[PDB]
């Protein structure tokens, strides 16, 4: 079955390159009519140890089955190349943000955020750090079901140049530990990224839109103050930053000063996610029990709502 063995690509037709997401093809199932999204995973099966490691990744995808994650449907082979087949979701959060220049309605933000935190939380409990949270990487169904894509397979088989392209593309959402070169980052980098989406979704403005990694740090520190000493040490030892000094800042512009209309509950949520010290950020499950989701029983009501959406939407 679609779970047991490699399937064939004969039943698929190409419909233009999806997206952003590397080489991800939009295809249609000739037999079912189902529209799908196909990514090229392996170039060559030949390397015996390589294949060994690919099966390790595929096995993990098949175990990351969740309502708020794009589903891997099947794996196909053609010649020496392997292709992962994912579901095709209607649109992205970025698409909604471009229709709504003043930000999203409060309840739409609650529903999108709750789902994002839920999907990320599941990743963390399976020892996966998503590392690529941004509006374009968060898909939305016609029924409003959020689905996270792009977490691990393509990134491992990637060039030093693809690593570099990724870091540039996610620049605005990268936590300070990443920007200074901490290679022992943890799950907390996703929480930071979620923090970034809070004010963006409400205000229709990116939070820290820097032009470079030094400029990114500057935007972060102007709002949130000095980096922790561990981060300063990494910065000073990082060849990327040779001849560059960390921002000194006389005047901090705190978040509530920048967005004085935002309620204290919303500000509190963002600040929790945006701790400069990643140890001080909450974990995902704690976030879902913030007042922002719990006032007027939103989280409870919405969990039931979401379960019916999911079952009739799929
Ligand atoms: O390792 C990987 C690599 C790639 C993916 C991945 C899986 C699925 C998708 C995907 C994207 C997508 N839908 C989509 C993507 C972009 C747009 C933006 N254009 C708007 C519609 C006009 C709209 C819809 N459906 N499925 C994208 C990437 C993945 O899940 C894991
Ligand atoms: Cl859909």
**Residue (of 75, 99, 83) closest to 25 by Cα position:** 83
Is 132 a known active-site residue? yes
Please answer whether residues 38 and 8 qualify as being in contact, where contact means their C-beta atoms are separated by less than 8 angstroms: no
Structure tokens at 282: 């909450």
Position 4 in a domain: no
25 and 158 together in one domain: no
Please answer whether residues 126 and 64 qualify as being in contact, where contact means their C-beta atoms are separated by less than 8 angstroms: yes
Please answer whether residues 226 and 256 qualify as being in contact, where contact means their C-beta atoms are separated by less than 8 angstroms: no
Domains of the chain: total: 2
Experimental technique for the deposited model: X-ray
Q: In sequence order, what are the beta bridge partners of 24?
A: 39
Q: How many Å apart are CA 207 and CA 230, to the nearest integer?
A: 24
Burial class (CB in 10 A: 0-12, 13-18, 19+), 213: buried
How many Cα atoms occupy the beta-carbon half-sphere of 272 within 13 Å? Answer: 17
Task: Look up the domain containing 68 and give its range.
Answer: 9-90
Q: Whose CA is nearest to atom 24 of ligand 1?
A: 91
Annotation-wise, does 19 bind a ligand? yes
Q: Which of 64, 90, 116 is the last residue of a domain?
A: 90
Q: Which of 75, 90, 105 is the last residue of a domain?
A: 90
Structure tokens at 179: 């920007």
Q: Which of 60, 90, 120 is the last residue of a domain?
A: 90
Residue 64 Cα to ligand 2 midpoint, Å, equals 20
80 and 24 together in one domain: yes
Which of the following is catalytic: 31, 45, 96, 132?
Answer: 132
User: Backbone breaks in the chain (C–N > 2.5 Å) follow which residues?
Assistant: 19
**Residue (of 131, 25, 149) closest to 81 by Cα position:** 25
């Amino acid at each position: 079955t679609e779970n047991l063995y490699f399937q064939s690509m004969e039943k698929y037709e190409n419909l233009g390159l999806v997206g952003s997401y590397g080489m991800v093809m939009k295809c249609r199932n000739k037999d079912t009519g189902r529209i799908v999204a196909i990514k090229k995973f392996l170039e060559s099966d030949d390397d015996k140890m390589v294949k060994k490691i690919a099966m390790r990744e595929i096995k993990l995808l098949k175990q990351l089955r969740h309502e708020n994650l794009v589903n891997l449907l099947e794996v196909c082979k053609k010649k020496k190349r392997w292709y992962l087949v994912f579901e095709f979701v209607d649109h992205t959060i970025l698409d909604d943000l471009e229709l709504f220049p003043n930000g999203l309605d409060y309840q739409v933000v609650q529903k999108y955020l709750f789902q994002i935190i839920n999907g990320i939380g599941f990743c963390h409990s399976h020892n996966i750090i998503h590392r690529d949270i941004k509006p374009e990487n968060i898909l939305v169904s016609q029924s409003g079901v959020v689905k996270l894509c792009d977490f691990g397979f393509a990134r491992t088989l990637a060039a030093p140049g693809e690593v570099y392209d990724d870091e540039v593309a996610t620049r605005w959402y990268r936590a300070p530990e990443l920007l200074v070169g901490d290679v022992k980052y943890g799950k907390a980098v996703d929480v930071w990224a979620i923090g970034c989406l809070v004010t963006e979704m409400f205000m229709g403005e990116p939070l820290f839109p820097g032009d470079s990694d030094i400029d990114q740090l500057y935007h972060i520190m102007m709002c949130l103050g000095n980096l922790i000493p561990r981060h300063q040490e990494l910065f000073n030892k990082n060849p990327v930053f040779a001849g560059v000094r960390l921002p000194e800042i006389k005047e901090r512009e705190p978040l509530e000063r920048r967005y004085p209309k935002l309620s204290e509950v919303v500000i509190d949520l963002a600040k929790k996610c945006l701790h400069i010290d990643p140890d001080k950020r909450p974990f995902c499950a704690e976030l879902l029990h913030h007042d922002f989701f719990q006032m007027d029983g939103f989280a409870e009501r919405f969990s039931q709502e979401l379960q019916l959406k999911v079952q009739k939407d799929a």
